[PDB]
Amino acid sequence: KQIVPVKSVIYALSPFQQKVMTGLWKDLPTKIHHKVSENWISATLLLGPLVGTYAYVQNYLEKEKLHHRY
Amino acid sequence: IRNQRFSLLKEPISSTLNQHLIDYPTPSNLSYWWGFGSLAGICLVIQIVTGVFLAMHYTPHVDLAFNSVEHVMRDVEGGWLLRYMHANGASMFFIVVYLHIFRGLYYASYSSPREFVWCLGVVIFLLMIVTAFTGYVLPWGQMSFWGATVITSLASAIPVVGDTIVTWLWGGFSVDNATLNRFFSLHYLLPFLLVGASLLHLAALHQYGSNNPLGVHSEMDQISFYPYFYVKDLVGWVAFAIFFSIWIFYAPNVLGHPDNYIPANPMSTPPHIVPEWYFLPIYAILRSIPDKSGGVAAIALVFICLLALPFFKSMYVRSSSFRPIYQGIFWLLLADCLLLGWIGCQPVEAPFVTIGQISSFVFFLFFAITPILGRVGRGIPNSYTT
Amino acid sequence: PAPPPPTAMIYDRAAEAIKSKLRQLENPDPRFLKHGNPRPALSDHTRILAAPETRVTTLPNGLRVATESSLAARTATVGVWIDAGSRFETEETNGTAHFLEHMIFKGTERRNARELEEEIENMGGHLNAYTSREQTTYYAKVTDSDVPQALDILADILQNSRFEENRISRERDVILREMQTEEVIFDHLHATAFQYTPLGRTILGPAQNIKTITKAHLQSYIQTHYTAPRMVIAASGAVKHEDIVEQVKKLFTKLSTDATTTAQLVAKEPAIFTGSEVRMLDDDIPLAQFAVAFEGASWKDPDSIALMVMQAMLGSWNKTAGGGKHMGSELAQRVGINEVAESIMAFNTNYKDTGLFGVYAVAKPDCLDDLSYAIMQETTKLVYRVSEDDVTRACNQLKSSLLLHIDGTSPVAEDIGRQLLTYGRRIPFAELFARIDAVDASTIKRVANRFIYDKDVAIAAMGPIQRLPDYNWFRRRTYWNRY
Amino acid sequence: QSFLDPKKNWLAAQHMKSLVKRLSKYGLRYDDLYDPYYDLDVKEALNRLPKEVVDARHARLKRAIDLSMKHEYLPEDLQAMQTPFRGYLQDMLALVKRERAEREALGGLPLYQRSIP
Amino acid sequence: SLPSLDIPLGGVVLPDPLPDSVEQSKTKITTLSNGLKIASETSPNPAASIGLYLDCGSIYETPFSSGASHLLERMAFKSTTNRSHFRIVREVEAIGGNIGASASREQMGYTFDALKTYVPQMVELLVDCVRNPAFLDWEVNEELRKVKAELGELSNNPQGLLLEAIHSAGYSGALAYPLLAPEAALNRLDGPSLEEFVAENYTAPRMVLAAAGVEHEELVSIAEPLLSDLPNVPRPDEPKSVYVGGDFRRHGGTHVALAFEVPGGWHKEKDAIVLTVLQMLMGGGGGPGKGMHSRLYLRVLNEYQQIQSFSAFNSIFNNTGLFGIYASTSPDFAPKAVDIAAKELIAIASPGQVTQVQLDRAKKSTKSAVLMNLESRMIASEDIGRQILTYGERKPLEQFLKAVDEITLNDITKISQKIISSPLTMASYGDVLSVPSYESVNRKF
Ligand code: HEM
Numbered sequence A: 001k002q003i004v005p006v007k008s009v010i011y012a013l014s015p016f017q018q019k020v021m022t023g024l025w026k027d028l029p030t031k032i033h034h035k036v037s038e039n040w041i042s043a044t045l046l047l048g049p050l051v052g053t054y055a056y057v058q059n060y061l062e063k064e065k066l067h068h069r070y
Numbered sequence B: 001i002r003n004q005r006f007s008l009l010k011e012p013i014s015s016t017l018n019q020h021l022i023d024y025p026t027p028s029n030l031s032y033w034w035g036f037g038s039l040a041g042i043c044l045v046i047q048i049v050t051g052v053f054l055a056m057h058y059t060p061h062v063d064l065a066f067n068s069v070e071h072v073m074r075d076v077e078g079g080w081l082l083r084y085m086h087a088n089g090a091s092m093f094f095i096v097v098y099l100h101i102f103r104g105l106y107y108a109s110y111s112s113p114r115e116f117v118w119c120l121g122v123v124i125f126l127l128m129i130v131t132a133f134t135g136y137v138l139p140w141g142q143m144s145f146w147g148a149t150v151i152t153s154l155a156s157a158i159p160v161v162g163d164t165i166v167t168w169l170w171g172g173f174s175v176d177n178a179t180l181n182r183f184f185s186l187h188y189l190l191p192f193l194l195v196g197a198s199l200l201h202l203a204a205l206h207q208y209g210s211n212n213p214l215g216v217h218s219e220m221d222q223i224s225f226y227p228y229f230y231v232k233d234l235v236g237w238v239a240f241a242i243f244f245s246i247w248i249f250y251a252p253n254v255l256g257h258p259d260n261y262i263p264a265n266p267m268s269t270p271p272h273i274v275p276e277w278y279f280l281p282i283y284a285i286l287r288s289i290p291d292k293s294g295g296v297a298a299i300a301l302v303f304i305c306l307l308a309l310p311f312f313k314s315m316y317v318r319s320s321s322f323r324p325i326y327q328g329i330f331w332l333l334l335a336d337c338l339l340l341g342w343i344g345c346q347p348v349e350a351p352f353v354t355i356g357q358i359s360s361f362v363f364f365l366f367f368a369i370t371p372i373l374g375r376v377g378r379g380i381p382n383s384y385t386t
Numbered sequence C: 001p002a003p004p005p006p007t008a009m010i011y012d013r014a015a016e017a018i019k020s021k022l023r024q025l026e027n028p029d030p031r032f033l034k035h036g037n038p039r040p041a042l043s044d045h046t047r048i049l050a051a052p053e054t055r056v057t058t059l060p061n062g063l064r065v066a067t068e069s070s071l072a073a074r075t076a077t078v079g080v081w082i083d084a085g086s087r088f089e090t091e092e093t094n095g096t097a098h099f100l101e102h103m104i105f106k107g108t109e110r111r112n113a114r115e116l117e118e119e120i121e122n123m124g125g126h127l128n129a130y131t132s133r134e135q136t137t138y139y140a141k142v143t144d145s146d147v148p149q150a151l152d153i154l155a156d157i158l159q160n161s162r163f164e165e166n167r168i169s170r171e172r173d174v175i176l177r178e179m180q181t182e183e184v185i186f187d188h189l190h191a192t193a194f195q196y197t198p199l200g201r202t203i204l205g206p207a208q209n210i211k212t213i214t215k216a217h218l219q220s221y222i223q224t225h226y227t228a229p230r231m232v233i234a235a236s237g238a239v240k241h242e243d244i245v246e247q248v249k250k251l252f253t254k255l256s257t258d259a260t261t262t263a264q265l266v267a268k269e270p271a272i273f274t275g276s277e278v279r280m281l282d283d284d285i286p287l288a289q290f291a292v293a294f295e296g297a298s299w300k301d302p303d304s305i306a307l308m309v310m311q312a313m314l315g316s317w318n319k320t321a322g323g324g325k326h327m328g329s330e331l332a333q334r335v336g337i338n339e340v341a342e343s344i345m346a347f348n349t350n351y352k353d354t355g356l357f358g359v360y361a362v363a364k365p366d367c368l369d370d371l372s373y374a375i376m377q378e379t380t381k382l383v384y385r386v387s388e389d390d391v392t393r394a395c396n397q398l399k400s401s402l403l404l405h406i407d408g409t410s411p412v413a414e415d416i417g418r419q420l421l422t423y424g425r426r427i428p429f430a431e432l433f434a435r436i437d438a439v440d441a442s443t444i445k446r447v448a449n450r451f452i453y454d455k456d457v458a459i460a461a462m463g464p465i466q467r468l469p470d471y472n473w474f475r476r477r478t479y480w481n482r483y
Numbered sequence D: 001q002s003f004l005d006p007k008k009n010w011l012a013a014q015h016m017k018s019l020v021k022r023l024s025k026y027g028l029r030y031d032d033l034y035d036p037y038y039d040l041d042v043k044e045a046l047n048r049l050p051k052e053v054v055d056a057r058h059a060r061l062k063r064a065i066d067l068s069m070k071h072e073y074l075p076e077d078l079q080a081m082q083t084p085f086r087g088y089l090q091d092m093l094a095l096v097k098r099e100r101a102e103r104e105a106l107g108g109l110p111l112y113q114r115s116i117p
Numbered sequence E: 001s002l003p004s005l006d007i008p009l010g011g012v013v014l015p016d017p018l019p020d021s022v023e024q025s026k027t028k029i030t031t032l033s034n035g036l037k038i039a040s041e042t043s044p045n046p047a048a049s050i051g052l053y054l055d056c057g058s059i060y061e062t063p064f065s066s067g068a069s070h071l072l073e074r075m076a077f078k079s080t081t082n083r084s085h086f087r088i089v090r091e092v093e094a095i096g097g098n099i100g101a102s103a104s105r106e107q108m109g110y111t112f113d114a115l116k117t118y119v120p121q122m123v124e125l126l127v128d129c130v131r132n133p134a135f136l137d138w139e140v141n142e143e144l145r146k147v148k149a150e151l152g153e154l155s156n157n158p159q160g161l162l163l164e165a166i167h168s169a170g171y172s173g174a175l176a177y178p179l180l181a182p183e184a185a186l187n188r189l190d191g192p193s194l195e196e197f198v199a200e201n202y203t204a205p206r207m208v209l210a211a212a213g214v215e216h217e218e219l220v221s222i223a224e225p226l227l228s229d230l231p232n233v234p235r236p237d238e239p240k241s242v243y244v245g246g247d248f249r250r251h252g253g254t255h256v257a258l259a260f261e262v263p264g265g266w267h268k269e270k271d272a273i274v275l276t277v278l279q280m281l282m283g284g285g286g287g288p289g290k291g292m293h294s295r296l297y298l299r300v301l302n303e304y305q306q307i308q309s310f311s312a313f314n315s316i317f318n319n320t321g322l323f324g325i326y327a328s329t330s331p332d333f334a335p336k337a338v339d340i341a342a343k344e345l346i347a348i349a350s351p352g353q354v355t356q357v358q359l360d361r362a363k364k365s366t367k368s369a370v371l372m373n374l375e376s377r378m379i380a381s382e383d384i385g386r387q388i389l390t391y392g393e394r395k396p397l398e399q400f401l402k403a404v405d406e407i408t409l410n411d412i413t414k415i416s417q418k419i420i421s422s423p424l425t426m427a428s429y430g431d432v433l434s435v436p437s438y439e440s441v442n443r444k445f
């Protein structure tokens, strides 16, 4: 494990010469749009089987319950 | 440079601590998902301290275990806080370990260099499972006693020595005082073995370096660990503290089972014997295929697959951020694991057993599809080359 | 905008150039690969190995004359090989062999000292001499028509040599001035392996014993060790066997006649290998040089060819070697890949009743432990796991080395003399090849189990050897516990 | 391969488009994802690669890591000028693998072995 | 359970012995129409040596390369277009052969040694390696690093350093290019430079494939499908070198060396023989037969003590010659050693100072040295290659022997006078702050 060198020029500003928490709640609609658009497939795949399986189980249990109602 | 003394961190008394906790170079682009290892270490330390302070008021006897627990709750000043911290922190320790494991699965933090890190993590997972099981048996509640009985009855699955092994582990012909004392001693012993395993885990990772969300070779842009990743870890610790206080002071027994507050009655049995919520995926894998030796073999196969995950080859692209198919497979795996855990807390009726059978198949299909995808995608650059 | 063209940036241009080079390198040519094969296999050389008949004649006095006649050659090499050396002489006379070698060309009853050199130079041939621990050689390379003169000179210096006190003193001064790190390592290894044995003592001998020799010990040593049965006249090149025999009969008549023989001397004082180790730590030399050796096999041992193949498998590697990392021998491959040793070489030595087989290495003080581990690991793989491919490669290499070492009339004569003194006969090339081919993986494993498996070692190290592993380490690594 | 060619397969074409979009955001080529610590054949190939190419790869990796740390992507112009899948390592990696394969076939010893962790 | 080595091993299919007087074979030369000279001769020993030689070297080198010959010698039998370095060495070791590469100012060669059985393998490997080598950058860099190390530890042999200094100082042109690359030239050397040098210089007319123990028919049958398809590039004009003389003085005892230039080299065959015989007569030193009774040994070495080494050297190139004396003495007596060497050089020039017996001994020593040197297969193949590269054919040894017979006192004195007339070249290395000036030493001749 050894550090590799890269020719670069780095300009950095003091932490007390710039705003700290103002950049958090900035461009929030754009950030939310990126989160939604870049991850909608992943959210569908994560919550797809869960919701469909829950609905199927609920339907099966309801069908059995009314079937055994005498 | 060594002629006269310099910064005391570089001195031999603090040299190793400095090199491994302050000046250790880590990638600068690590997300908040990398604080879960330190958070799990904090949870383990919390469990050790809280258990050490609970063992001063706990008597491992069948006629005194539940009464001692209630004495801790009521008579001991702050004992209710102590036991709630212990139980809910075991729950959060398993939560953060699950997040740790799944983040590693997503970012392929195991593939070529951290195979030993992943193997040590699997050993740590086994140790945590055993320790949590024995600790849950310790209060000697109805659910604790019957879960201990059932899970030890799984040991009667080896065709030759299963009965001998289960009888020797029970300390007799049934779960009784001998089993309680045995489990108390083991539950005290294992967390220190867990500490040793965690130290080996950290050292093995520090041999090569932490993976990054990009999965790329990260040595050109690295920063010292202390000034930049202690504050991020502090943010993670404070958020976890808020979550932990929420689950202790307002919903203490939500994660627990109500039947554990009934004194253990060997004659009677609860209508539904279910382990703790964090053993539910393993229990569902057990009960998916109908058998006992088959279920034990399935659990062993699960652990063998976890151990053999890092040893697959041709996984040149590490991070799942640059693998759409693998990202979809991982998200399907996470959904499958959640569904399996939910199934583990359900009866053995027809839809539940069918879904459990399907879920385990998907779980192993993840461990096959990953090598298949790696081998298929090894030839990506020649095909998309422009 | 648009992506830059592949011939716009420096890195893109370099990548394109190297990709083009790799593409042009990718395609092979079958016409340039039809015959060659990188996997060694046994081959038949019966037709190739045709050599002139080596005629050997035994005179009634016990003298042996061997000739390899080749009338096409314009030169020839005529020499005398004597079964004598540092071993067959007592402690009180240790430098006598070397001193006699130095005095053999310094004066005689008729050719004098400067007159002999003038005659040799006018003849144009070179008259050389050398004494080993068990063999002595005085040989002259001369043109075809000068063979009788060379034989007469050899007979004169062997029989009618007279030593003067002034010349003895001058040669003693020269020897003291003369008194090679590899040579000193080998001498120390021989001493520490054959302590309390004539092979242990060095050829040069102690300085006091060298100075205490004058005109009597030399004559006694000649009369004792230069008898007719122990001398072989080897002639190679443009020599006629009948003429050589007739001239030897005419000339060599005043030879010493003693009942002592090399076999009787060896039986009286045999050679015993004592496992031991000597370390000369100096740290002022940049390189550390150490040799490790085992029991080994004698000249008349059927496993001598197996030891030759074994040391061929162990191999030799040098920093200037063309092969580098890419070589047949596993030890050489490991050394070249890891850059641990400056120069490694497996050496096999054979004597009348024992030998020395091992590895001599030169390396930096930092890599000594790794080099020693590699040496021991390969030497123990040599008994535990042997590959048929490696055995075939080593057999081919040994055959090639033995045949390429011939390369001239003087080495032909040297081979004839040495093989006679060692065996009683000159092994033909076809029989030697059959002996080499009879060695396979099973034979190598058996011989290595006989000689290396859990056997005492002789270690001789010099230099910055503070990192070298010790004798117990070497002795335990001599065997494997996994098998 | 038939199904892996974007021309003959629509699924492969969409996968290639998504991969190009993902790589161009951080401005690093596909071969930059290869880890020298992974196979050590990548390590040997990068050792044999020219210094200019290695330096450019390291600069691209540093830029990608900095962008990931800043939680931002390359601007639109640089994303347009980004050219992923312009290979620089595949040929030398294949050559190293072929040399290793022939060395293994003809007995031999590995020129380098991954240290046991 | 094989028998002991004393006892013959059972039953063998050993062949019948060769006759005592096998007919010595004459060299056979065939010119492939692109201009490539394939030569062979038959030898009775089972060992065959095959070399392949070219007119390349420092003389044909350009100022761009300055070390290409040395690096090609180091980059010999490396990875080629058809097979890699591992395959090269494995093929070499499978048959047990040995490879070698020699680089000189005028001509450089690649030699291969193995049994007579593996003739096709030797020819194939040599032709492949010479014709189409792949100058890989990593291999070139490794060889460059090795040459850096060698130059960093090059002072251990001052004789080669002095010879290189003499060749660099007494010449100005093609022959002045050093055989060892300097630091800057080594740094700027690389794979493309080597490939361009080989492509522009390894042209068909300048290859001689010589065989020492290979039948001509087999060698031709193996080498025709491998060298016939080669461009017929005309031979470039021989690079020109002019002699100017000079002095080289380096500080690092002290080792001095004087030298001159006899006009005409190997092409002036009789004068080359006279130069070799004169060098043998000079001899030198630092058992009997190693020039112990040479003139320098008799009059300079043993007579005058404190002289560590004193010998004579020569170097003969195509249409060029160089002869001189290398000395290595204590720094206190360097000027007197230089004066003694000058006096010896003048004494040889003056007629009547060489005994007839001494010259007869020198002739006998030269004849014996040549005869015993050409007794090796490698030397035989090298002689074939060099002779064909120089004269276009392998001159019979009888011509050389007859020239050595024909040399005489008048001829040797005339050649010494021609040696003296040429401008003096000097090279001194070591404690060189007490040696005499170049002008002062030159005024003695
Ligand atoms: C050596 C340190 C430890 C000691 C002495 C200890 C001791 C105890 C005791 C006495 C109890 C029963 C008291 C009660 O639950 O109110 C208990 C419960 C428990 N322990 Fe531990 N423990 C230790 C570490 C751990 C660790 C590391 C874990 C997690 C792996 C763990 C998991 C549990 C669990 C899940 C329970 C059940 C809590 C409940 O619902 O009643 N313990 N432990």
Ligand code: HEM
Pocket (backbone or CB within 6 Å): B033, B034, B035, B036, B037, B038, B040, B041, B042, B044, B097, B100, B101, B104, B107, B109, B110, B114, B117, B118, B119, B120, B121, B122, B124, B125, B198, B201, B202, B205, B209, B210, B211, B212
């Ligand atoms: C006792 C519970 C555990 C603790 C205290 C723990 C602690 C840590 C720590 C401190 C790190 C380094 C910081 C980091 O990279 O996040 C780490 C990394 C890691 N852990 Fe764990 N760990 C635990 C359980 C596990 C488990 C069960 C696994 C699964 C095999 C695992 C796999 C890993 C991996 C792969 C890394 C490398 C992270 C990366 O490079 O991306 N850990 N762990």
